[PDB]
Design a protein around this nucleic acid. Structure first.
Lengths: 49, 96, 389, 54, 24, 243, 46, 35, 61
RNA sequence: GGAGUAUGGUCGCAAGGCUGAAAAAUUGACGGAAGGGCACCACCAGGGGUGGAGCCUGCG
RNA sequence: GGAACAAUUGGAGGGCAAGUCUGGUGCCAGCAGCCGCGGUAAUUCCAGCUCCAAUAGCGUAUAUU
């Protein structure tokens, strides 16, 4: 039944915001690249150094 | 090497198994130990696909290699007594 | 769950053999007599922590009592960035809690014997409050240098190269307040795995013991003390041997969280004797009593006498390393391993190792004379996972 | 080399086409189209630039 | 005192590397 | 035939024989262990199944069924075993798609990708990329229509384009295990295709994924357009002459 | 937090990677070229 | 024209390589004569 | 020291919108973000390591 | 062969702990009184925000 | 009557993606690429890409001459 069943959206290639439910992305746990450097959080060690 | 035209040797380890570029020669290289002298050398396979067939501790016939890493002098020709090129054209299977 | 054990003796040994076999076991009645502190001991539970950490896919449960446990072994993998850690050369952290008395080597020798049977390397980093580095009075646990230069050359004999066997200390430490305490950090990089180690034949007599080396460590005290220890020990041994040579080493102090506090004060000395025949080595250690303050000369005499006793008693391998080399010879290939043991050297611990291996189901030991030549039949399992390229 | 490759190796990829529920917005711009756009836009901005130069 | 061994014996003994068995 | 991942598959390896579903991956360029959808014809790949463990470098063979009524070549596949573990690290690609809502010079809003500002601010700083090959970055969720967001790009993207995010999502195989005990009699799992013909189910087929023959109309551009004040202030030698 | 962590991890990982392969190709090319030079000199005397 | 020009680039590369071959052969042979 | 390096912390410049009498630092960005980053380490860095780790110590005591 | 340049690996030194966390000054250290110059963070003439209620980025 | 009564062996080359990998003062470049979103009774693709050699014989290794 599962093999003959429709693939989940997590394994269908594209997942459009029409396809999947709402908060499903926060529920998940994935990986992605980034681009760029975020700023350095000026913390105690930065300051005291 | 020696006086022979070919050499039989033992696959140590396909060094360059962690490769990034497919057709790089450090992908295609493999350390072998030529049997009669028990010596470690390294050789090239002509193709990455054939590198997928070759595994360890298989007897390897190899010969000279003459025409980004110039200096490897040998190239593997037969493994476990079967022609690598015939495997690569999918003519025969490999005896294991 | 399937195999069962009883008592608390040879806990690490039973455990590591269950790892090495993948036999799911279940042990009962750890501390049944002790109504005071029944169940586990803290070094044991940190040991279980470390085992779960280093391995993968293993399941371990401990009773509400804490006195019965059950363990489904997974695989020996090591410092992996996918599951365990972040990088390849990432070091896996291990704290052990402050209420530890037992030895670092008491953690190491099981880890040391298991780790050449991993898929990738091992990168353990022992920190924590209870990281003693010295010998214990305790169960007379080994010290770091003793462990290193006393058992790792044996892996060199077994086929595992010391070239990629790596152990380094950064801080050393004694017990301090009672048996508990510690503070010295260590890290070990077992970088040599093998398919199957070499099955070995130590059968020739280790007759002419050539020399003696050793190491005096002092952690918090003046170096005059370990100097005096060298004087004492050479006064014992120079009637036997010219080439006795002991390095000395001084560490200021380890400092531990409560704000921090100095601990691990003490000193001790390690003796190793080296036979001209092959890698045959006799070791002993002595450590000052953690609250005592006895004379370092007496400690030198004591360690000297211990070395002399193992000289008299040991056939080739000493009793401390006996379980190790036996287990490795067991995990050697499906052949005969031939060790030359001495008659006095047999321990109830060694007999227990025999018994529990027989419970595991690998083959047995044949015993003929020459001291007693023991021979084992290797089960030839080796590591289970390895990325054969 | 070129003789060390299969014919199915030598075979091609075909480019995908615009989703048929979206042909309203013209073609699906891929790398050919992109670079032709940026060719013309770099050129015409460089000509504007040399003009403000003068 | 004569315990002071050598730089070489130091390097083989107290260093991170355990001494191999198969050397002289 | 070539064979699909997740399909049943009977393996002859060691003493045992056992029916399982494998998970096919490549080793992308020795990076990330990417889950295939079909096995690569005339190419080695990496499979991962769930069953008995064997010390490595062991040969094995492989079949789709033991039917005598197979017209030809009942064997299907072969190779050696490479490694064993628990909980492999399989990944498959995931493309999170939007479509541009408005397009300014650089910064483009994108709408139909997300269902919440929450999901966006999880994917803060996200490495986004239009099909045409313009790179770019997701920077803030847009507030007034819930689920739209702001992104900063490398040129003027086009309302024609589709905004795709590349991500990598792990898969794990299923832990089914049939010991194909032939002599006692035993249940074989069936294949998806005969399953579809049996249960009278058409194979899923996408109008949006079937390949098509594209017309490329030959692009020309508008002529150069230069502003009023510029053609005023410039010096004689280069003024524009217009009739 | 994932951005700082991923940056640190990625930089370090590929740095170690390229270091490893640089050393590997140095070893192999040096060995093979050394042996090639020796065999060339040996044949060259003949 | 573009096909021929690229090919001429290839053949010039061949010429430069053989020139370097001849050059280092010359200076190898000559250097021993100057030792 | 804590005073004349006031930027160890935040306060409003205004003083109270309403004086109420019954018987000023407003919280520290630096320690706050520091403590939090330690927590984000000890949870999400640890898990992001342990992406794919199966099984564990079932301690009931 | 020579001269450079890189690159990696080898080798030796650096790599032995009276020890156990928290000054310089013939020139310097610190004031004080007077006198000047300045400033919508001073005086003076005014002006104008915020601070009252709602909305919400941000910050704590 | 070619989808066959089923020519081979070498060499060189060109064309490619909602793919991958690496480098950087943005679009560039490099290597490469059966791996592409879907889909296996589905696809009908450069539809059998181009050219050189030998051809029922030829290639490669080493020794060479």
């Amino acid at each position: 039944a599962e093999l003959v069943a429709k693939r989940a959206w997590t394994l269908a290639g594209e997942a459009t915001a029409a396809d999947r439910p709402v908060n499903s992305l926060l529920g998940e746990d994935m990986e992605f690249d980034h681009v760029g450097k975020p700023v350095p959080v000026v913390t105690e060690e930065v300051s005291e150094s | 090497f020696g006086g022979s035209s070919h050499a039989k040797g033992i696959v140590l380890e396909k060094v360059g198994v962690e490769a990034k570029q497919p057709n790089s020669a450090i992908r295609k290289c493999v350390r072998v130990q030529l049997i009669k002298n028990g010596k470690k050398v390294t050789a090239f396979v002509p193709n990455d696909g054939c590198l997928n067939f070759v595994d360890e501790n298989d007897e390897v016939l190899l010969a000279g290699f003459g025409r980004d890493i110039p200096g490897v002098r040998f190239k593997v020709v037969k493994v476990s007594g079967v022609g690598l090129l015939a495997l690569w054209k999918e003519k025969k299977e490999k005896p294991r | 769950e399937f195999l069962r054990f009883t008592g608390h003796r040879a806990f690490t040994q039973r455990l590591v053999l269950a790892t090495l076999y993948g036999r799911p076991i279940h042990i009962s009645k750890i501390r049944s007599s002790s109504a005071t502190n029944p169940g586990l001991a803290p070094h044991e539970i940190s040991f279980l922590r470390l085992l779960e950490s280093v391995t993968n896919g293993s399941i371990i449960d401990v009773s509400y009592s804490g006195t019965t446990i059950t363990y489904q072994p997974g695989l020996i993998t090591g410092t992996v960035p996918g599951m365990n850690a972040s990088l390849s050369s990432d070091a896996i952290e291990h704290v052990i809690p402050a209420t530890n008395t037992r030895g670092i080597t008491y953690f190491l020798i099981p880890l040391a014997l298991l780790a050449p049977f991993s898929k990738a390397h091992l990168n353990v980093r022992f920190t924590g409050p209870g990281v003693i580095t010295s010998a214990t009075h305790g169960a007379r646990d080994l010290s770091i240098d003793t462990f290193r230069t006393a058992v790792l050359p044996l892996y060199g004999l077994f086929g595992i190269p010391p070239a990629r066997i790596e152990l380094r200390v950064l801080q050393r430490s004694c017990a301090g307040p009672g048996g508990k305490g510690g503070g010295g950090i260590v890290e070990m990089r077992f970088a040599s795995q093998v398919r199957l180690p070499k099955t070995l034949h130590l059968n020739r007599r280790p007759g002419k013991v050539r020399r003696i080396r050793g190491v005096a460590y002092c952690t918090g005290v003046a170096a005059s003390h370990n100097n005096r220890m060298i004087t004492a020990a050479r006064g014992v041994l120079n009637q036997l041997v010219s080439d006795v040579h002991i390095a000395a080493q001084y560490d200021p102090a380890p400092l531990v969280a409560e704000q921090k506090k100095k601990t691990g004060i003490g000193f001790g000395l390690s003796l190793v004797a080296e036979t001209s025949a092959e890698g045959v080595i006799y070791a002993a250690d002595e450590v000052a009593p953690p609250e005592g303050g006895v004379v370092p000369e007496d400690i030198g005499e004591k360690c000297a006498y211990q070395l002399l006793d193992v000289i008299a008693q040991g056939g080739c391998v000493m009793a401390a390393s006996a379980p190790t080399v036996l287990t490795l010879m067991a995990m050697g290939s499906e052949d005969v391993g031939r060790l030359r043991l001495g008659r006095r050297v047999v321990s109830p611990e060694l007999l227990e190792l025999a018994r529990d291996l027989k419970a595991f189901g690998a083959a047995s030991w044949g015993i003929r004379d020459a001291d007693l030549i023991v021979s084992v039949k290797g089960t030839g399992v080796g590591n289970v996972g390895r990325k054969v390229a | 080399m070129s003789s060390l490759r299969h014919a199915i190796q030598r075979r091609a990829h075909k480019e995908r086409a615009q989703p048929l529920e979206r042909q309203r917005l013209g073609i699906l711009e891929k790398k050919k189209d992109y670079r032709l756009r940026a060719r013309d836009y770099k050129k015409k901005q460089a000509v504007l630039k040399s003009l403000r130069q003068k | 005192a004569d315990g002071k061994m050598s730089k070489q014996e130091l390097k083989v003994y107290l260093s991170s590397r355990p001494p191999d068995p198969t050397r002289k | 035939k070539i064979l699909k991942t997740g399909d049943p598959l009977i393996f002859s390896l060691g003493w045992r024989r056992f029916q399982t579903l494998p998970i096919y991956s490549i080793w992308d360029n020795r990076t990330r262990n990417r889950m295939l959808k079909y096995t690569p014809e005339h190419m080695h790949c990496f499979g991962t199944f769930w069953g008995p463990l064997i010390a490595p470098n062991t040969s094995f063979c492989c079949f789709q069924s033991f039917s005598a009524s197979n017209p030809g070549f009942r064997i299907a596949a072969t190779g050696t075993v490479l490694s064993v573990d628990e909980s492999t690290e399989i990944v498959k690609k995931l493309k999170l798609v939007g479509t541009p809502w408005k397009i300014f010079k650089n910064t483009a809003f994108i709408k139909d990708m997300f269902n919440s500002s929450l999901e966006i601010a999880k994917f803060e700083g996200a490495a986004i990329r239009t099909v045409s090959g313009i790179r770019g970055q997701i920077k803030r969720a847009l507030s007034k229509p819930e689920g739209y967001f702001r992104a900063t790009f490398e040129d003027k993207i086009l309302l024609s384009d589709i905004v795709i995010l590349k991500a990598w999502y792990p898969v794990k195989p299923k832990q089914f295990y049939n010991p194909a005990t032939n002599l006692i009699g035993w249940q074989s799992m069936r294949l998806t295709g005969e399953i579809r013909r049996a249960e009278n189910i058409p194979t899923p087929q996408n109008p949006n994924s079937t390949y098509r023959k594209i017309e490329r109309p030959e692009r020309h551009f508008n002529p150069l357009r230069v502003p009023k004040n510029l053609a005023a202030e410039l010096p004689f030698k280069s003024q524009i002459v217009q009739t | 937090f994932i951005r700082r962590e991923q940056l640190r991890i990625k930089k370090e990982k590929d740095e170690a990677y390229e270091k490893k392969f640089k050393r590997i190709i140095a070893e192999i090319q040096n060995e093979e070229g050394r042996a090639a030079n020796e065999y060339a000199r040996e044949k060259a005397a003949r | 024209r573009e096909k021929l020009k690229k090919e001429l680039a290839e053949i010039e590369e061949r010429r430069r390589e053989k020139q370097k071959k001849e050059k280092k052969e010359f200076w190898e042979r000559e250097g021993k004569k100057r030792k | 020291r804590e005073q004349f390096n006031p930027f160890q912390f935040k306060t409003n410049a205004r003083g109270p919108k309403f004086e109420v009498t019954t018987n000023v630092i407003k919280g520290r960005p630096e320690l706050s973000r520091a403590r939090s980053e330690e927590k984000r380490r000890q949870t999400i860095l640890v898990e992001m390591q342990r992406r794919n780790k199966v099984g564990g110590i079932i301690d009931r005591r």
